[PDB]
Design a protein around this ligand. Structure first.
Ligand SMILES: Nc1ncnc2c1ncn2[C@@H]1C[C@@H]2COP(=O)(O)O[C@H]3[C@@H](F)[C@H](n4cnc5c(N)ncnc54)O[C@@H]3COP(=O)(O)O[C@H]2[C@H]1F
Lengths: 169, 169
């Protein structure tokens, strides 16, 4: 159950820090980008570093203003987020702050390291536990007040998947 | 055993990324800072965000040149490190890149969240497991070739603790 600690690490070291400041950073940029942080959670733990090559309809636009803070002895640790435009039939259908959930890469990499004691076939179960644990945290989290939306999916169109969550907003 | 996953997360998401580039970043700054990344691992999981207030003899000097990379959909994710001067009896005794091991904060914060299922009295055991696991990884890690030194300590002078590791180098 490594995913339990990674989900709490994902909340303690990231979400609870950046979500309270997220609205103000989006308003600063707009002065339109949506008001939520959209987190992609592929359950196969396949996490590309370049979103534009995961789906051509996902196109990088710009970055939010950086958020900095002193963290564990590091002066001005930088928290940066990227804004993407979502294309549909050659039309701009939405604009939002979009990114993958990084700890899913940790699950994938542990499955490949023999010293990690992590079976290759346990990725799907741990990914589902990571999503379930993060859902339980964010549902009760005060830092999250319509601040982010989890997008979990099993791939048997990624931009169509994100747009479906956008249109409900 | 949440610490096992945090240690592998600490290596997969940080050390294996920044350690291969660390020497070149230090050489760029020197053109003197020591050649190793010194990681503080307090076993009580007490991790101040400001190193200068943990010990007055630890004084922030400057930052290394930033390292950037596309990470999980985030364009130009920033990896920054701080350089500290270590004072002894009013004398500059050493200069090195110094920081705490951030996941120890995750252990501490989980101990305070009732939903995390982490006992307050398990911090010391998990901290020791985190250090032990990280030691096993770095001992066999190709990315670490005289690139970093772990500084683990139980507090019954922090600058004297770091200087002892520096003088062996
Ligand atoms: N640049 C850095 N400087 C100093 N230390 C660093 C740095 N980078 C890594 N580390 C180490 C490795 C460990 C796991 O790293 P990971 O696998 O990327 O998991 C993260 C990620 F999913 C997210 N996350 C946090 N910050 C950001 C951000 N700025 N942008 C995007 N995502 C972010 O939260 C998780 C827990 O974060 P953490 O700080 O508690 O643990 C970190 C920390 F210990």
């Amino acid at each position: 159950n490594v995913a339990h600690g990674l989900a709490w690490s994902y909340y303690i070291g990231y979400l609870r820090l950046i979500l309270p400041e997220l609205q103000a950073r989006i308003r600063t940029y707009n002065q339109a980008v949506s008001q939520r942080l959209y987190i992609l959670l592929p359950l196969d733990c396949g996490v590309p570093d370049n979103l534009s090559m995961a789906d051509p309809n996902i196109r990088f636009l710009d970055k939010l203003p950086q958020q900095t803070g002193d963290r564990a002895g590091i002066k001005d640790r930088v928290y940066s987020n990227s804004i993407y435009e979502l294309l549909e039939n050659g039309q701009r259908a939405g604009t939002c702050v979009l990114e993958y959930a990084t700890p899913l890469q940790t699950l994938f990499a542990m499955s490949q390291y023999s010293q990690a004691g992590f079976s290759r076939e346990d990725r799907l179960e741990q990914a589902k536990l990571f999503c379930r644990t993060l859902e339980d945290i964010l549902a009760d989290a005060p830092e999250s007040q319509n601040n982010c939306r989890l997008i979990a999916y099993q791939e048997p169109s990624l931009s169509q998947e994100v747009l479906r969550h956008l249109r409900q907003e």
